[PDB]
Amino acid sequence: SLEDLLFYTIAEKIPVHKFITALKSTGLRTSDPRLKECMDMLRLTVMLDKDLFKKCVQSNIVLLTQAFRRKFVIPDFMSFTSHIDELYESAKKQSGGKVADYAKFSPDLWGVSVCTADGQRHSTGDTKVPFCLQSCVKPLKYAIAVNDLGTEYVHRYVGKEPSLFLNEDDKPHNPMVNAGAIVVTSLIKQGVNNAEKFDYVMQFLNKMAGNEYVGFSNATFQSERESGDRNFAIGYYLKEKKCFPEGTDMVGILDFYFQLCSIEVTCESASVMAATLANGGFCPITGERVLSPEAVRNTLSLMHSCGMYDFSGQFAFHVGLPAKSGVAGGILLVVPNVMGMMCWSPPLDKMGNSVKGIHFCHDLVSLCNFHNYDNLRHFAKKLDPRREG
Amino acid sequence: SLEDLLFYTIAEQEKIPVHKFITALKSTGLRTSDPRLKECMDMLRLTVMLDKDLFKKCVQSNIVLLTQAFRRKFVIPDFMSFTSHIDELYESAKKQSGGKVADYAKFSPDLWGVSVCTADGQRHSTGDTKVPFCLQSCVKPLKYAIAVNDLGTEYVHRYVGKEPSLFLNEDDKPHNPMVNAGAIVVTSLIKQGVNNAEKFDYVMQFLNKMAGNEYVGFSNATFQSERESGDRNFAIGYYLKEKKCFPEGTDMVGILDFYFQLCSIEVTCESASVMAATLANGGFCPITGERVLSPEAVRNTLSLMHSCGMYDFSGQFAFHVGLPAKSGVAGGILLVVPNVMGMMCWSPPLDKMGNSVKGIHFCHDLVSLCNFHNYDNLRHFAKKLDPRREG
Amino acid sequence: SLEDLLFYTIAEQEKIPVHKFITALKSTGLRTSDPRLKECMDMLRLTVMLDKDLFKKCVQSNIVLLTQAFRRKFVIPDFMSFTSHIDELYESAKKQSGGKVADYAKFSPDLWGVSVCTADGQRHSTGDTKVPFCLQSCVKPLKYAIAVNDLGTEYVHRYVGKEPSLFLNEDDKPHNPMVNAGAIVVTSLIKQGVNNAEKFDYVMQFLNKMAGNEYVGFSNATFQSERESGDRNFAIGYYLKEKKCFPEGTDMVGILDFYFQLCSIEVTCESASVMAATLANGGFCPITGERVLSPEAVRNTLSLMHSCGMYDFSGQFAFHVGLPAKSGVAGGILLVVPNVMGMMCWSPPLDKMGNSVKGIHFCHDLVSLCNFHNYDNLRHFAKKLDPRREG
Amino acid sequence: SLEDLLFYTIAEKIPVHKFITALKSTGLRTSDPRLKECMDMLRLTVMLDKDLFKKCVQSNIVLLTQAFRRKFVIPDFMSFTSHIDELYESAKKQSGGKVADYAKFSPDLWGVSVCTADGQRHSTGDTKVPFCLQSCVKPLKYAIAVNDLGTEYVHRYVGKEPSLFLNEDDKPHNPMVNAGAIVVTSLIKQGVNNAEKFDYVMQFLNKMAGNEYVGFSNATFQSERESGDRNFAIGYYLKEKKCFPEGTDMVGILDFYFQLCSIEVTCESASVMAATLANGGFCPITGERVLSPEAVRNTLSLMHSCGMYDFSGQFAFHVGLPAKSGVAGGILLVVPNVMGMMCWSPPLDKMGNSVKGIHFCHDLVSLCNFHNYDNLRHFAKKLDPRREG
């Protein structure tokens, strides 16, 4: 039987701690939601045997086996993890950039979290501090919209390419720019009032993050409606051009838009969000299906072309990964079929992207064959974390 | 023993006819003419029943590969079913009879062909895949790969930009190598110093390598037609000369002539499909096993195909198809599906934006069907089918 | 004696009837209601035959001008013939029945009127010149003149540009005061500090001066309509607020409301024609003799009318007509012929570019006929006729 | 009789010199072509009397009277002339600018010539040196074209407004830019070969300048075909777009275009050209009709909008006069109904206009009410040279 087979794999009686260290090794976290029952059993008890063991691991056997038979998308997780630490310390040195002077804390924070498509977790630095999604949320509400309404409908209102405000057919160029994000906001969960629409998006972000940290920054929501002249301008221009769905309260939508920009996450929780996008719309730490593959494909496409503001082409060329930056200092990054990530560092460059975060993404792809158009079979001197030795 | 084990798997009882072994091999998708199969095929022709021993004698040579092929470890294992899908898509697009043909081309509006060469050498064609047509702008990715391979990204991009689009961008570089201006600057970096005839032979050599040595030709008829309406290109040429866009000591009128030549290069669906596959395959020609391009050159070529490869229709195309491709005014669409296969679709009648009507139809169809989109998931892909899997 | 000499020139033998003197005066183009003629007309009404003495008693007052008028030293001396030409042009354009009316306006497609006031006070109208319509964008030159007159070119152009055309130019100033953005910034410089009702009264005062005190009104109907579709203007308003385009401590939503108000101001062809003439006349209202505008303000207003006054049609218009003008969505075209006269043409139906169809027709016609083009020659003007001359 | 009346006007016997000084005073030049016979008579002879006088002045009486009865467009010419000298010395101080590094002489040359619509002449500085028209010729060949073919026809090929190369209807924006000047060149005198076309334009420029200096700089013609890559580029682009008239040799037209750019003039002769444009198409020193009023109106219009390159709007706003600058350092300037001018000074500004020349044009209009939209009746503190005291 599997838990016998596995009992031998890990033994030659078993000391409990010695099984925990074995597990964390595979990349998994003790807290893993899919590992609940097993941890519940172990928490009813310090030295297992085939009967005691089988008793606990029974309910989560398929997963535990796949982790211990090194069948995760990244077999040598410990090795891959120390490279990430190298990349982190390397990007730490880069001390350029200005903080959003309108943000107001320390320019000495920096964090990276990884969540594989298999649930494997890693962090370095300030990964547990909450910060604001800002523009990092634009791909998310877009996914939500398409998930609920579908490509066809959603792109009656917004465009699908890069760049003024309005494209050929008088739609905002795409939903990664404010004009387009504002429109997309007006499509989500119509009819109900804003408070309820908001509760709904928060619920959706919760599934996306496997229920890890998602919060809200009223401080930020106030600064946004505060300095939102530019955004109000766009709003009226959109109203005038009849860009919204019938029966829309435009001033209402802007207010909604600002709340969404003030949603909080951490490197860790966000990395899980990113991971769901890596993973076909399935949240990798709960196994729950959150987004239609169609919403995920569309989101990854437009992140690719339009995710790093003015720097999107340079980025697509040298990095080749769907990412999305935001003004609080985040870079949501997705490596399809492998992992999702969240990089956070307050100081931005001219173009509005986290300086350290940009340094990190470049280094990452220069190291491993994660570039969209890297070949998995011949890739020169890069390394492939997906392979054993 | 490896050729024993395989003898047992194909032998049902202690002698195999030669036609039965041949017929089992064909279905795996390989052609008998496969270059990595030459010795084996020689040995066989030099003889009608093999025993464990007379068979060992004919397969030992290319055994690693004969194994992977019979043990269905190819990139598309059930190649026969995948192939019937290609034919359905082909027939589906054969119906779409829109579009106007280029009028500078004197070709049948009812020519239409598709060829596939997988990253492993598996072949399939259907329709007019043997006729030769000119690459035209389809050549742009190829010669850009050649440039970056001989000179390296850094140098080649001192002279040409790397992004979509008044002819020149901010740094007074043409926008990217997939537009005429960019293509003319790239043309000027290849094989510097030596004369045109040689630069040309040199590229043709390189194309032959990429095509695994199948048909690469040349159409003087077209090359003359090109130089007799290259008013817009001469303009570009003079403007670039003025903005100091070429390397030192470039003869611009000569580069323009070299560039008309390259557009006039000929291929067939089948040979082009092999070229596409070399690009799909990290630089190795998949039917010769030979390294042709630095993977750095292949990544770049692909990047720019995805973003500026379909003329004004690139954005729509990248969103809906998500595959690097390049079209040309002759009716050709070079298509690459990274890690899987290369393709070439040829149908002369173009739509409004300069792309083959049928080739375009076919490309959307292909991705509706299989999870080949750049941003499809290999685990969860809803209703699409994965030709890389078994059940 | 001056009033003797003139008595002799109009007296044919030693007593003049009053109706004969009146009838001779009318033909010179003056109206009896002329403000610089008031005392003379009072004296006359206070009385039917004048002798050398009872006439001296009624003309001494405004004698300088009565002289210039009877001695044909006006800017257009044979005013009666010039007037019949205006009517021909009027009738010529009355035939042109193209164009759509603004649908935000509920006016007869068959309303059409033209008024003339020369730099000397000579008046002529024909068609519906008594009906009141809204200035709309026709007000833009006026309030820009007011700005530059109260504040001076240098200041006013710290806030708005001075050239034809993404809303903002290089220096992040609206392009020019004749487009909505420019107009909204200008609106924000006038009468700073005090409240809107007063700023408004203040402008109306200034318009009354410019119109020699003839009809300036206001349409609340329109002002309400304007504020109920000012989505595009509120957008401009927010964008300007963001780019720090206003002076210190401007209330933007209030400026936008003030600006809708100014668009809703009412005039008639006749009163507007006097305004136009003040602009034609270096700033002096030609029927009151009163200075209303610095000539520095008048030159600028005119410069910008010539270059950005006819919406997207300014370049064509300046080439073919060569006269500063401004149109508005109500159907009005403020026209100035420097040193000669001002005009106002009103016909509600607009063409594709936002200009009155008949007003446009009429303006080209006018310059076909007379050498009034900015760049016609006063000596050699081929087949055109000069209304400033005698034979 | 007129020459009696005039004899008294100038006497109370007449010493010949004393009549010459009297004449030059009115603004006229002794060499005046319309004063030929009179000067011929005086040159058959030193102390006239009514018989002797009448004898000489008879043939040119109408003109001489109009000059001596101060009936010229500028009555107080001597006064107006010293202001011009003020303006000249004022602009002389301004020592910025770079010379066309591709031109190659002294950045210390500077000249202004005036020719009134009445023949009155004045110069200061280097007004007798020949320099190249360069772009200053663009309005001239345009006038020629329209004179011979008419507005309707000529604007089938070129535009009439400011700005890439091609406008809405695929015509160059206007003939003051190279693309448009090249087209206009292809319209002039078709059929005949270039040498003959050129002879014809030279003939036309001769009438325009009252037969004053017009020459040709082969040195310049060679530098032009030399560095003409940009121009060749435009040529092919124009060929491709079918912008030329049927049966045109495009490479031929470019060569023609370069010759025209190498035509020489002086401040003095050019000022006469400008004067013909001021004067309705009549050459003011010969009385000859050279250009249709239609060609003159059109030329003045497009000089107004497009004559000073990028600086055309600034210029139109602050100066209000039709002008046209050229890269050798000329500014052809026209004050309609009054005078024509030529300002020359090698050093250019960023935009390509003579620095001193720009200084001069601004000062000129700030002084006198010559601005297009100045009022001749109320004009504040400017002076009106057209009026007596």
UniProtKB/Swiss-Prot annotation, chains A, D:
Effect of residue 325 to C: In CASGID; increased enzyme activity
Activity regulation summary: Isoform 1 and isoform 3 are activated by phosphate. Inhibited by BPTES. BPTES binds between subunits and favors dissociation of the tetramer into dimers. Inhibited by 6-diazo-5-oxo-L-norleucine (DON). Enzyme activity is stimulated by phosphorylation.
Record's keyword annotation contains Repeat: yes
Transmembrane segments: none
EC number in record: 3.5.1.2
Residues bearing PTM N6-succinyllysine: 24
Organism: Homo sapiens
A GO cellular component entry from the record: mitochondrion
Comment on protein domains: The C-terminal ANK repeats prevent the assembly of the supra-tetrameric filaments.
Subunit structure: Homotetramer, dimer of dimers. The tetramers can assemble into rod-like oligomers (in vitro), but the physiological significance of this is not clear. Interacts with RAF1 and MAP2K2. Interacts with ATCAY; the interaction is direct and may control GLS localization, negatively regulating its activity.
Tissue localization of expression: Isoform 1 and isoform 3 are detected in brain cortex. Isoform 3 is highly expressed in astrocytoma, ganglioglioma and ependymoma. Isoform 1 is highly expressed in brain and kidney, but not detected in liver. Isoform 3 is highly expressed in heart and pancreas, detected at lower levels in placenta, lung, pancreas and kidney, but is not detected in liver. Isoform 2 is expressed in cardiac and skeletal muscle.
Name of encoding gene: GLS
From-to range in the entire protein, with total length: 138 to 546 of 669
Functional note: Catalyzes the first reaction in the primary pathway for the renal catabolism of glutamine. Plays a role in maintaining acid-base homeostasis. Regulates the levels of the neurotransmitter glutamate, the main excitatory neurotransmitter in the brain.
Consequence of substituting residue 162 to L: In GDPAG; loss of enzyme activity
Catalytic activity line of the entry: L-glutamine + H2O = L-glutamate + NH4(+)
Record PTM text: Synthesized as a 74-kDa cytosolic precursor which is proteolytically processed by the mitochondrial-processing peptidase (MPP) via a 72-kDa intermediate to yield the mature mitochondrial 68- and 65-kDa subunits.
Binding site for substrate: 135, 178, 224, 231, 257, 309, 327
Protein's recorded name: Glutaminase kidney isoform, mitochondrial
Modified residues (N6-acetyllysine): 160
A GO molecular function held by the record: glutaminase activity
Disease: Developmental and epileptic encephalopathy 71: A form of epileptic encephalopathy, a heterogeneous group of severe early-onset epilepsies characterized by refractory seizures, neurodevelopmental impairment, and poor prognosis. Development is normal prior to seizure onset, after which cognitive and motor delays become apparent. DEE71 is an autosomal recessive form with onset at birth. Death occurs in first weeks of life. CASGID syndrome: An autosomal dominant disease characterized by infantile-onset cataract, erythematic subcutaneous nodules, profound developmental delay, self-injurious behavior, and intracerebral glutamate excess. Histopathologic analysis of skin lesions show deep perivascular and periglandular lymphohistiocytic infiltrates and pronounced leukocytoclasia at the surface of the dermis, focal vacuolar alterations, hyperkeratosis, and parakeratosis of the epidermis.
Family named by the database record: Belongs to the glutaminase family.
GO biological process: chemical synaptic transmission; glutamate biosynthetic process; glutamine catabolic process; intracellular glutamate homeostasis; protein homotetramerization; regulation of respiratory gaseous exchange by nervous system process; suckling behavior
Effect of residue 237 to A: Decreased enzyme activity
Keywords tagged on the record: Acetylation, ANK repeat, Cataract, Cytoplasm, Disease variant, Epilepsy, Hydrolase, Mitochondrion, Phosphoprotein, Repeat, Transit peptide
